[PDB]
Design a protein around this ligand. Sequence first.
Ligand code: HEM
Ligand SMILES: CCCCCCCCCCCCCC(=O)O
Length: 579
Amino acid sequence: KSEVAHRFKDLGEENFKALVLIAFAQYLQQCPFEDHVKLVNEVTEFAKTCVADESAENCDKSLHTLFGDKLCTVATLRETYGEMADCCAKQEPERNECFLQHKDDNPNLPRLVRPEVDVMCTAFHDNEETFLKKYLYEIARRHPYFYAPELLFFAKRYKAAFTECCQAADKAACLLPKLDELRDEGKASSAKQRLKCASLQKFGERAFKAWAVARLSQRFPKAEFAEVSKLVTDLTKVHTECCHGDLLECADDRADLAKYICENQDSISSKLKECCEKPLLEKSHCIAEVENDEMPADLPSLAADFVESKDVCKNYAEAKDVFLGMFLYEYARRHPDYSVVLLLRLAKTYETTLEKCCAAADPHECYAKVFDEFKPLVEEPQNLIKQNCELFEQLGEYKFQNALLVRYTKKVPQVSTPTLVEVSRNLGKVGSKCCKHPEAKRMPCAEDYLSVVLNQLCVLHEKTPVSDRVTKCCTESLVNRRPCFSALEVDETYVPKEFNAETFTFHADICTLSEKERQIKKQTALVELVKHKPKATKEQLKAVMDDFAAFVEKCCKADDKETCFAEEGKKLVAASQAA
Ligand code: HEM
Ligand SMILES: CCCCCCCCCCCCCC(=O)O
């Protein structure tokens, strides 16, 4: 009746206030902090109002309306936003769709920074509130499409950090490690959702639902197809809706989707019991990260319904897409251990098949050997996971990274050295954070991490194109992306680098540097070395890295550093060059 008083109630003034603020700071990305706060209090006062007397004037007004009605209050709306001010001329449904166009995705405001730990804690102290709010403000404006609720989620964590680290003795040592963790974590989520939306516009809905059908019926094996369909569909609207920038519709539909999933809890998953006990703002979040339920076991076989049984083509023809979804749902709920995209791949295959068979004399004998073709597809990833994990075992994380370094560098030598370093050590942590798991949960794992890394990689090659091959990959569908890379061969075109003493000239600094440092300086040298002599047999290289490993101990453990490095250095450089 007065949805605001309705939200204000289950949200709580705090949560209401911050949410309202972010919303205004993602639409009016230029107005000064103060002006927004005025708006926040302004809108809140009205909310408390409705909470008292629902019937009060305007309280019946829809949220988009209330919003777009207050958006059209700012006077410097035409001065500041110029064209956008026109929007106010339209009626709700259009007025809002209008504001959304003017949302500067990547605007031009100064980077952010990180004041002195001491200035911070002081700020955080004198005025707890305005301090946190301002930053919240700064961020939101720099990321107009970031999901509001989730931002608020980070918010409270921050607040914890400060009320925790600003009291200890060693401040910078209690806070800095967390501030860094909130950053990287925040940048993952930012990258994460931007990719999701990137997929939605490029390959569209159809594709998008396929992904959603797979993943969901993977997380909810016991739900009926009709049930998973609904979710997938509802779910698709939501994404489309946030990606557009509609904090509101996004927030509501998400709100509903969770209410629906929690009322029908027993009809979907047993892993939801906890999630649904939690408060409004926290359910959605809890559910999207829920563990997979466990499969029925008394499940039939796929062969029956999709390969043997005639009239297969008849079914497919009545509703080609509904049928494939069924195929997908079925195959998927039996394989938590598969990767969403692997499943998609098969799904793709099966589809292709049918089109090339249902128009034949005897179809039933045409597509009977389907399940065999899936074998190559399924084996391919599994090998790479087996092959690559074992190798990660023998060699510690660090040692395994070098391996990849030596691997990929030989693949794309043209890339920047520091680049390769980063893309590798990152690939290393994957093999660790994943292989530590049992089979069933490996691919899924690999896939979840690998997708961002491989993406992070594309963000860099695009900014500094060096090779087409890597570009070719980064542009192909999301399904092929990964395969496209595993398909890269050693570069025989490349013409080795010319020796550069200083490149291999190591002084005594690495001795007192933190492991992370030593490792980097070391790894850099390696990459370089492989750029100098690409035809280096796996053997040769180790040989080299070993003398070096020791070389480093023999010098930092000597009484005369710098002299040991300079003297013993020409010796390693020679013997090496000798191979
Ligand atoms: C309620 C408070 C806060 C929230 C919700 C928040 C949220 C975020 C998010 C989502 C990002 C990553 C987005 C991106 O760069 O692409 C980020 C980055 C960052 N945040 Fe915060 N933050 C808060 C407070 C602070 C505070 C108090 C500081 C410093 C005193 C800070 C410093 C930074 C820095 C340095 C980055 C990285 C910026 C860059 O990459 O150039 N944040 N934050
Ligand atoms: C109309 C909504 C239907 C949702 C179910 C998707 C059906 C799967 C068709 C095959 C998807 C191929 C995906 C791809 O190769 O990009």
